[PDB]
Amino acid sequence: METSALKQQEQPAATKIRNLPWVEKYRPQTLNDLISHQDILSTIQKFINEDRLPHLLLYGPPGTGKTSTILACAKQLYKDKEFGSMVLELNASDDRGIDIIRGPILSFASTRTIFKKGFKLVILDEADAMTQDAQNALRRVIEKFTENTRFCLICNYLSKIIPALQSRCTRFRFGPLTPELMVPRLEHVVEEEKVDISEDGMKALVTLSSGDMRRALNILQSTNMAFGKVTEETVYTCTGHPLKSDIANILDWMLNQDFTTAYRNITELKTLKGLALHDILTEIHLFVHRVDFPSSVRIHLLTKMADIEYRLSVGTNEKIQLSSLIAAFQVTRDLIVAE
Amino acid sequence: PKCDSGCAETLFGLKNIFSPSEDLFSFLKHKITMKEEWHKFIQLLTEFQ
Amino acid sequence: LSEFMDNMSFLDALLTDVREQNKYGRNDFSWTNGKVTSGLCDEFSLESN
Amino acid sequence: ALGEFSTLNSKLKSGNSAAVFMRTRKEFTEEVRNLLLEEIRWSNPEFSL
Amino acid sequence: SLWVDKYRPCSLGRLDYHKEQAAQLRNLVQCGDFPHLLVYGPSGAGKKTRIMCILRELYGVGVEKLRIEHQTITTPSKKKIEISTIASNYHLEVNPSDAGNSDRVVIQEMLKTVAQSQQLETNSQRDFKVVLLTEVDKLTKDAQHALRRTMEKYMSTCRLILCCNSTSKVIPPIRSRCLAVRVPAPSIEDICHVLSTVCKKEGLNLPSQLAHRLAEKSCRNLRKALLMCEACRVQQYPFTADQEIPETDWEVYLRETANAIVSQQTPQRLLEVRGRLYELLTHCIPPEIIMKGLLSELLHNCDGQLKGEVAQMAAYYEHRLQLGSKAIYHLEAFVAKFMALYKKFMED
Amino acid sequence: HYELPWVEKYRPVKLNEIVGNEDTVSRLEVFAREGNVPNIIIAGPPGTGKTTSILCLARALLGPALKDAMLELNASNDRGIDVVRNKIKMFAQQKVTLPKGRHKIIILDEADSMTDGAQQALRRTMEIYSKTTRFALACNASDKIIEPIQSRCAVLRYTKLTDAQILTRLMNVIEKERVPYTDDGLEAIIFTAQGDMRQALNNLQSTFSGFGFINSENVFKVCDEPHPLLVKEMIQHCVNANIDEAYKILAHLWHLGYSPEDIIGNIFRVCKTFQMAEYLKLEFIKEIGYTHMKIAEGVNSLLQMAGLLARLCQKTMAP
Amino acid sequence: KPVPWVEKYRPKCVDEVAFQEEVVAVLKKSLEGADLPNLLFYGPPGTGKTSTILAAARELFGPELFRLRVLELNASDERGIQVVREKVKNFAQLTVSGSRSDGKPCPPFKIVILDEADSMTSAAQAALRRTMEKESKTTRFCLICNYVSRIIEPLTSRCSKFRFKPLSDKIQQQRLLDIAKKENVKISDEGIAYLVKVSEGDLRKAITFLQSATRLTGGKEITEKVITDIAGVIPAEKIDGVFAACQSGSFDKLEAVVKDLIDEGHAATQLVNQLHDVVVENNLSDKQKSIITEKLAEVDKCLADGADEHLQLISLCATVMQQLSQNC
Amino acid sequence: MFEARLVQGSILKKVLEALKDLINEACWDISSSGVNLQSMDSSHVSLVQLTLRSEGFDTYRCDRNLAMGVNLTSMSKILKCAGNEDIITLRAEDNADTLALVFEAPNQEKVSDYEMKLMDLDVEQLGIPEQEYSCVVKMPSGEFARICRDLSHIGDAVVISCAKDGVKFSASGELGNGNIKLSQTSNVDKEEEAVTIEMNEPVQLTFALRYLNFFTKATPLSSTVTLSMSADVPLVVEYKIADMGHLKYYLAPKIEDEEGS
């Protein structure tokens, strides 16, 4: 029940004199305004304008723009005098069991409209959190009400959705947004907001964001407020992400020094900078395919850090796992350096 | 009259996998090379697992 | 055959099973319990498997 | 290509499947039934048939 | 009413060996606000007798009365389970491990009802009810997390002695809030002393040679020593220094199995040894016990370079055995790989 | 005028039109022909034809009385204790005049959402009224049904469908729809439907509505799987033990945005039917299962796929 | 009735916490404005992060309002993120009136102290981020993690992050002297030094072991033996005997030594820790060092998987045995 | 700045118990014309509408148009402790977030006052035109309550049909079918109402039992009720409260499907 109170209060909510949520500044409005995934949006426009909209499954990593897209589609299909009469919005906030599917959903999909005649629509945000029996009733309520009401399923993990439910709808994946298309957006935000930023700043902003403009705006917002300047160092310090120079020195210590010296240096740096061994493993793996090695070095090293990433999951001692991480390089690469 | 052995593999749904001429252990004993035969052996193990 | 037992030991440990074993008791051949009677309530599981 | 990731063969079997039974079980006479009773008795000597 | 329970010490001062930490436990119960205790040591070293002695020291002798009560609990997955628990008016006894992956469930509600019992039953003796969780090494990770949530919710309501053999599977947060009590195995002379004590308490007199031989054969397991001594008593009314101390029958069946291991290396021998291990597992012997016994048997004939190799393949295969569910496959994998190595070794 | 989905526009109405699990098909055919069917539990993969077979069996056995002597429960209905208390017992006691050998029929669509106590109630009702009433049920996992419900029934098994059968039904439906196509689209549309042709007709309709022509590129634009040729190239590089290119295009799939789980599943189903040595195939399968357990336990990163690929590649060089 | 010393002896106020200077400055400035931000405390455990946040909440609010306006939870829940999210929603939704008689009214936002902030997945952390943005104004949080690196980026962009470096051994030696003199227990300074060196810079574990030791002894002298076996710390001559058996050339004395370790009750984990600590700072070859340390790592995995202590120790000693005896 | 004086609190209690289960919350909008409520179901299948004229209240005062939203459960908890004969005051400020219910003394010795927080929500003015209905009847409320609760325990849904013969109720339940036929010559003796039609064409639709039972929870408001019904424009239940206002109800029918061959 409710929780639409907080969203409706939140939409025109800002201090507007001191708060500056620039993530909330730049919102696309319609499919012609969402400048990404243009094939998907044009396909939606084609299916809408032919009265041939199939059941939809919009899935992808969060923040890629599924909810605003389907909100634009809903406002396009139906005017503001009949939007609540034809579109039902739900999510996992109102989880009481499977009674949602046989309650509001089954009652809503079983009736005609109220004022004007036309096909209806239900959007189910975060439908991955629906239980297996809830989804298993949801497939039936789709099957026996397919001609009256179309269904939109907003999801984040494709695999968990039961096969028949993905079978009765077509699917659209909101993939990561390509960096070549995301650099002009951040350049526009920077020039509009008079921000000093270098090329490593753009590179770190797009690399950390992993094709999400919301998360990029969050990072640049935080760095601009915390420092007033944005670069690789300022972003990574504000993020608390591994600095590339630091992990480069970590790699240098395993590839040049001996066991004990590199061991205590990396231990002191982890204490000094607050790093957990998972992220060192990720960033050194990012360095492995870039630094030139023979193939045998690459397979042996990759297998060993894979097994270390396994062993770190169960929750063993991180100290001995760091030691084995140094040992992986000490076995092969430093022996060849001696050679 | 002719005997009617073979309700055991029919119970496990193995007749939905193999040919009616094929027997279970007869298919097990020989060498598996054909891609279709190997998918039927995969489906057999998939049913028992 | 020793290589085969190495493989099937790998399929016991380092392959998951379809149904999670020892879900309600321990492994088989145990005198502690194993009298896991089925459920008696109409409330759904609400599990996240 | 055809059958690149599966068993899509150009040739297709016809007449091997769809073998309808239409089986009419003739009612057993006294002699063959008693022979089958004695077969059961020789299979299970401890059963009061 | 065997020798281990009839002649069990009842108070802290009646303990015969390891007097010092018994006195420290007396100081702990004298302080009156002891936090949760974890107690550990090898089997037969005297953990449970120390636990019940500090229980009897803690409350009155109403600890000494014991009954059995049965608990039926619905799972979060809605499949009820029935377990048997030992109970008293002052303490509770739970071994959760019988629930398997549902150990976590057995963590909360009984203790919660024990909390409710602490909210219900008032005697003005002490402000908590203690419960002994047995074999906490077999608790799963989520079960231990649920235990941590239970203890950081009901620290002022109930207490818990944690009987285990190894704190390895105990996660470090559980080790962080519970006081460690290491209970080492008794020495040979201590076993002989308490053994002569229980024989004089039985009215029997034996030579010290039998006591020392029995102490060495028990391998610092005092419970096994007392049971075996009772077996020697059943064998002979008088005690003679060369009385044949009996051998454990599954141990010697395992020994003949190992004889079949080292004798012939044939696939028929593998299958018949597999049937022998089937007989052992139908006799409900734990798989790690079977493994430890068989490796300790077979290592006596192994040469120096073979012993180490057998060591890492045994540890690796038993790592998979605890990773695995059905121990049969891992045990047969070990035995067949040892067939391969051993046959490769006498041929060169 | 309404766009009827082809999954229900081309659902069979006669039992012979259903392919797959042909022995049980013939048994259901003879039970439709004669009658006095026992209680049936159909179990199999989803989208196999279980509900179709049950409904066609009911239609063939009843005929005009299908609106009265038949009653249906799915997970959309209540299916609690009180309805299996009142409604199903009231029908099982309800008098219906039928031809000889013909019984009232109750269908429990996808009985895996029955609660345990609901089945415990259902047992006596289904076993005492067996003179006039028969029960049919469908499920995907038989273990979700309690043991006495099986023990009071005959249970039948359905399997994932043979690709030749799927190919025949798809050429049938594109003949009845006049669909322009290539063979490329046929192997794509079937690879996207591993034995479950409900996916085949669904993605067929999606391809025809979205592009209007059937070829591999259109199928993989609408279904959005990682490309079969890319992962075939991955395992081919594994055969050559060439780590560089295989990792490069794996990183390409990663920044393309595919999840860990469908990548490892596609890797499985591509190195399954790949043309290469059987022993190395066995090693590859066990390795990809091992890495899949890593994703399944929670840890799902590029480092995991890199170590996957590395052990795959070192399998070739190490004898 | 009585309380453990760790909360009994934690500082009441910020400025009373020692060894941290910029942290005290920024927390004091945020307390002066009566608008504490959302905090993210990272550093080794026992460094005083919980003590600092409790002191800050005690300074901002009233002591009777302190426990009312804080809710202490942990985040590695075995029942999922939905349960703790529902508790957070229940605590934020439930509002109780609060005032101070000291002359300053309390801020309207409450405090939820959620520890182990480095232990969740990215999905659960994103759910917590949505919960964060749900209650941005009416509750400000303090996430305590061992490592800031595991924090996903939307949280780290809106939280004031504070490093807590471990304290130099002299200052917590002085603090433990203060505890000992205020808790009337006879301890030698060598005992306090040994307690520090087995505490490994963890002041919270140090004072926990100190209170536990003084209640074990009941007022007697806290010897080195009781603090040797209250932390589970293995005696060092046992480690030396293990290395001597590995150097010796006999597997019989190897398994005899392992049997001596296991029937003593000494856990395999602590043995692996001290074996590793010896090996990392030795004159051994880096090839041998690497082979032994990867063996140690996989043995740690094996024992965490439920394997026997004895088997893993035999295999570990066999590998160290072969590595030492290869050069000999 | 808003003052309303409910003449009798029995009407307010009656409308609240009439809509107690229907809706999540009550969002009223006030104008100099009067007070209005057009709130549409959480399951999104029905709408309650209530228009009360300014002259119906003892004193109605407005400064501007205001739409405020109130949670229903606490509103019910407050109003269930009020006398039915009482005169009530509803006070709303111009920009405050609290509405005041000033109940006069039911016991003539204790004036009661209660407060309610305001809950912000997106509410749209569902401005449906009032088209000409092909079927209009007037028929007493208590009879319509007794027949819905009659057919509810029979059927999970009711087939309404309106023809020249009269108004007709069917319900095919599992126990069996239930039919009720009324006539225009059929005049009742319980409240002395002659059932009438102003219909044009026969129409048959199907509606759920639950909502109609909770529409009959609005029985004591008016003696007779007006049913308006069309082939496309859905079911209208209209109570005409004496000098207070009118209470319209929009319920959409269930879809109907033809059985396959």
Ligand SMILES: Nc1ncnc2c1ncn2[C@@H]1O[C@H](COP(=O)(O)OP(=O)(O)OP(O)(O)=S)[C@@H](O)[C@H]1O
């Ligand atoms: N392609 C895009 N271009 C511009 N803004 C975008 C784009 N995608 C997302 N956004 C922003 O994201 C906001 C909401 O997007 P959402 O639909 O909520 O993202 P999502 O993919 O649905 O995943 P969630 O909602 O975070 S779980 C919009 O208001 C935009 O500011």
Ligand SMILES: Nc1ncnc2c1ncn2[C@@H]1O[C@H](COP(=O)(O)OP(=O)(O)OP(O)(O)=S)[C@@H](O)[C@H]1O
């Ligand atoms: N073997 C088949 N032959 C012909 N059409 C089929 C077959 N299997 C599925 N279909 C079609 O796909 C639809 C799905 O069939 P169902 O029987 O509902 O699937 P199922 O095997 O019962 O598994 P479910 O429905 O996921 S529990 C049918 O309505 C047909 O249109």
Ligand SMILES: Nc1ncnc2c1ncn2[C@@H]1O[C@H](COP(=O)(O)OP(=O)(O)O)[C@@H](O)[C@H]1O
């Ligand atoms: N001081 C003692 N006097 C007599 N018997 C003892 C003493 N200490 C231990 N024992 C015996 O040793 C056995 C050890 O069993 P238990 O108490 O369960 O400890 P553990 O848990 O280590 O096996 C007990 O049966 C007990 O009878």
Ligand SMILES: Nc1ncnc2c1ncn2[C@@H]1O[C@H](COP(=O)(O)OP(=O)(O)O)[C@@H](O)[C@H]1O
């Ligand atoms: N800098 C310090 N000044 C004063 N006391 C400290 C300091 N650091 C640690 N302590 C003591 O150590 C204990 C650490 O507890 P806690 O705050 O939980 O540490 P953490 O939050 O780092 O785990 C506190 O109770 C406090 O008494």
Ligand SMILES: [Mg+2]
């Ligand atoms: Mg979204």
Ligand SMILES: [Mg+2]
């Ligand atoms: Mg089906």
